[PDB]
Amino acid sequence: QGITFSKNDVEIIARETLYRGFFSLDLYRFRHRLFNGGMSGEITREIFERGHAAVLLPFDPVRDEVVLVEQIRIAAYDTSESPWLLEMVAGMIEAGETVEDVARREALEEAGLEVGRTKPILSYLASPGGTSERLSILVGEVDASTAKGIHGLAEENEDIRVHVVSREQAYQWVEEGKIDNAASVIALQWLQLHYHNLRNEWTK
Amino acid sequence: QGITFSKNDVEIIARETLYRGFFSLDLYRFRHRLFNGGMSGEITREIFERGHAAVLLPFDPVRDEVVLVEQIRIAAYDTSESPWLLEMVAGMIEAGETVEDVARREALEEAGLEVGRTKPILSYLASPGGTSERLSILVGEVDASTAKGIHGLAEENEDIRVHVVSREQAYQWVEEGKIDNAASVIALQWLQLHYHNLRNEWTK
Ligand SMILES: Cc1cc2nc3c(=O)[nH]c(=O)nc-3n(C[C@H](O)[C@H](O)[C@H](O)COP(=O)(O)O)c2cc1C
Ligand SMILES: Cc1cc2nc3c(=O)[nH]c(=O)nc-3n(C[C@H](O)[C@H](O)[C@H](O)COP(=O)(O)O)c2cc1C
Ligand SMILES: [Mg+2]
Ligand SMILES: [Mg+2]
Ligand SMILES: [Mg+2]
Ligand SMILES: [Mg+2]
Ligand SMILES: [Mg+2]
Structure with missing residues (x-):
């Protein structure tokens, strides 16, 4: 029960600053395991970084x-x-x-x-x-x-x-x-x- | 009871898109009524826009x-x-x-x-x-x-x-x-x- 994959199952290849101001927007570039048993290609996601x-x-x-x-x-x-x-x-x-x-x-x-x-x-x-x-x-x-x-x-x-x-x-x-x-x-x-x-x- | 002010009490001077990709980062520029009376000066806020x-x-x-x-x-x-x-x-x-x-x-x-x-x-x-x-x-x-x-x-x-x-x-x-x-x-x-x-x- 619970989730399937851990940090062993994903690699963040790089992060790119898309915007730097008071806050930031980063592009995370990563690959990760798939539920069907394979590995993804390179995925990119825009992530708003504004602290916690x-x-x-x-x-x-x-x-x-x-x-x-x-x-x-x-x-x-x-x-x-x-x-x-x-x-x-x-x-x-x-x-x-x-x-x-x-x-x-x-x-x-x-x-x-x-x-x-x-x-x-x-x-x-x-x-x-x-x-x-x-x-x-x-x-x-x-x-x-x-x-x-x-x-x-x-x-x-x-x-x-x-x-x-x-x-x-x-x-x-x-x-x-x-x-x-x-x-x-x-x-x-x-x-x-x-x-x-x-x-x-x-x-x- | 409830909130004190409405949309009539804020002036959005401008919005500026600072970044546009999959999502957007917009700068809102505005002034608004103060609780003790009067209006604020111009304020800017970076707002992550990704729809709803x-x-x-x-x-x-x-x-x-x-x-x-x-x-x-x-x-x-x-x-x-x-x-x-x-x-x-x-x-x-x-x-x-x-x-x-x-x-x-x-x-x-x-x-x-x-x-x-x-x-x-x-x-x-x-x-x-x-x-x-x-x-x-x-x-x-x-x-x-x-x-x-x-x-x-x-x-x-x-x-x-x-x-x-x-x-x-x-x-x-x-x-x-x-x-x-x-x-x-x-x-x-x-x-x-x-x-x-x-x-x-x-x-x-
Ligand atoms: C269904 C779908 C969902 C997506 N969701 C996101 C997302 O949540 N965040 C993001 O940054 N990009 C998202 N994307 C954008 C992709 O990461 C990518 O930038 C886009 O598909 C263009 O890829 P390409 O430059 O290789 O042609 C999504 C794309 C698709 C098709
Ligand atoms: C205490 C404090 C809190 C702030 N919070 C935000 C915020 O939530 N969002 C934002 O976009 N900017 C925030 N800012 C940045 C200000 O909006 C403004 O960009 C910054 O103070 C520089 O203003 P200036 O160009 O007049 O020097 C904050 C600044 C300070 C000092
Ligand atoms: Mg590792
Ligand atoms: Mg607070
Ligand atoms: Mg506070
Ligand atoms: Mg879902
Ligand atoms: Mg879906």
Whole structure:
């Protein structure tokens, strides 16, 4: 059971920089084993290289509340009613940093929030047919009464509004499509599947 | 409650295609309303443009089983033990096509599956800070006893193996990180939250 082939079964021959800017687009050139027993020819794939992220679900287990951050994501424009999205605290992981350190820093910068205990949720590939991006989600214990106002680093063009909702309200917003970005959907579905045990663990 | 601003509150000054090949990388140039009042200055963001996708979770409600497809995703290489992933049926939406048309076609091409009823799951933005990609997920009724073998269009370097597992096993693999691509995580978490009602609906 499970997958069939490993890194022993693929060779990346080269990678070519197609675009170098704030992010990169690379052409991976590779060969790989086929399920029918043979080897492929040379395959090329364009891969968006934009580093990797830490994501924090800020959950108040006493009040059963979730903290959301609202900010514009221009890429949402063409397929969404508004480019302002309700999301999780999140940011890029730089060389040598831990997921948890990034999550704590972004929680302060983006929501004014201190974080207590944490637990991993899931680490996922956003869209692995075309981007290498992995996002590692934690749940962090917060006092949602301290979450309010306008945050973000303005000198970085980051303008963020904090919203506090109940867990059930946040999940309803997922069901209705009002929250519809992968990181938040995954985190809030996870919360719906684990909140009983998590609240118990964090209110003992 | 909900979001604060709409499309009237952002001005997209220009878009510039920085790279065009199989996919594109566009630079969006825009200004937008700020929460504390006023307008931002001009901001630029590099956005990976690769169109949008239809995704099908193939669920057998008689057997409580799911059909997974396995194929290499080279972008997973640098952060995963293997680039071969277990995933949902999925394909790009071409001009004029519906999500449902694409989902049904890909289920046949990628898994040899005829699909009975479908229902929407969720439509999500994969990673809206850096890509416009939206993926719309349906759950599709299948007979998992008909799912086996090697599929995908080999003339297009799409080499796919079918796997059948229990829903519970597929969800356990999400919890364990053996399934860790967004489309499958979102679909299988949704299934874990809705399967009881879905099985009742589809075995009437
Ligand atoms: C069905 C199909 C799917 C493809 N999918 C991708 C893809 O996901 N990413 C990518 O970079 N190129 C993709 N390509 C493009 C191929 O890698 C290649 O650039 C194209 O087929 C032209 O090959 P040629 O220059 O040898 O004629 C796809 C091509 C086909 C026909
Ligand atoms: C903190 C920070 C975050 C940034 N995030 C992004 C980003 O997500 N996407 C992007 O295309 N550029 C991003 N940029 C790059 C800026 O959009 C801009 O290109 C860069 O600051 C250079 O601007 P300049 O030409 O005025 O010097 C970021 C820059 C900074 C300082
Ligand atoms: Mg080797
Ligand atoms: Mg952020
Ligand atoms: Mg930030
Ligand atoms: Mg597929
Ligand atoms: Mg296909």
